[PDB]
Amino acid sequence: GTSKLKYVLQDARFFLIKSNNHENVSLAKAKGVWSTLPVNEKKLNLAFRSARSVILIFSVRESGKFQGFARLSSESHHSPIHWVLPMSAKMLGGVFKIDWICRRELPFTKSAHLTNPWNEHKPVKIGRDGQEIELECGTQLCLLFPPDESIDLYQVIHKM
Ligand SMILES: CNC(=O)c1ccc2[nH]c(C)c(C)c2c1
């Protein structure tokens, strides 16, 4: 069903995360963590205190797809992570813990009807790493992903 998913997304905030390689998204999926540059780290920490759920929607650059979405379970904090960088390791910030809500892909062709008011109404696939996605656009984007039957949102609801 979709009822628990809709509950988790209620009054949520949404951020587009752009990764330059698949390896970092796979590590995030395996370990339940993300790290970003300080300008985005500060924004995500502010958002985490501001909203019931903060949702990161991941896209690997040049893939033409989103790779899934996840909810922040903590602010950033400073084991290490063997990220693959394009940079010099210590240019990144702290580590955010995340709970995956969907690990399945969604092609950009399926989100062509979604525009983001916070990025000049460009298609939601367009945005810098860290671009906030307005509530209605972000909710509809998350609802487009294929259902991920491996995930149980019961534990995620209790963290709200
Ligand atoms: C120009 N931005 C970057 O190179 C960049 C930004 C955010 C990032 N998060 C992680 C895990 C990496 C490797 C990374 C690189």
The CATH number of the domain holding residue 114 is 3.10.590.10
Query: What are the tokens at 105?
Result: 């892909």
Q: Are 146 and 66 in contact (CB under 8 A)?
A: no
| Element holding 54 (H helix, E strand) | strand 54-60
**Domain with 104 in it:** 1-160
What does 86-117 look like in DSSP terms, one character per residue? ---STTS--BEEEEEEE-S-EEGGGGTT-EEG
Per the entry, the structure determination technique was: X-ray
Residues 6+ apart with CB under 8 A from 34: 17, 28, 56, 70, 95, 96, 98
- Rounded distance between C-alpha atoms, residue 100 and residue 71, angstroms: 6
Query: What are the tokens at 155?
Result: 């534990």
Which residue out of 19, 27, 96 has the highest number of ligand 1 atoms within 8 Å of its CB and is therefore the one to mutate?
Answer: 19
* Ligand 1 site, residue 85, Cβ cutoff 6 A: yes
- Rounded distance between C-alpha atoms, residue 133 and residue 13, angstroms: 7
Atom of ligand 1 nearest to the CA of 83: 13
> What is the number of domains present in the chain?
1
- Rounded distance between C-alpha atoms, residue 98 and residue 28, angstroms: 8
CA distances from 87 to 20, 37, 56, 73 (A): 12, 10, 22, 27
* Ligand 1 site, residue 24, Cβ cutoff 6 A: yes
| Element holding 70 (H helix, E strand) | strand 68-72
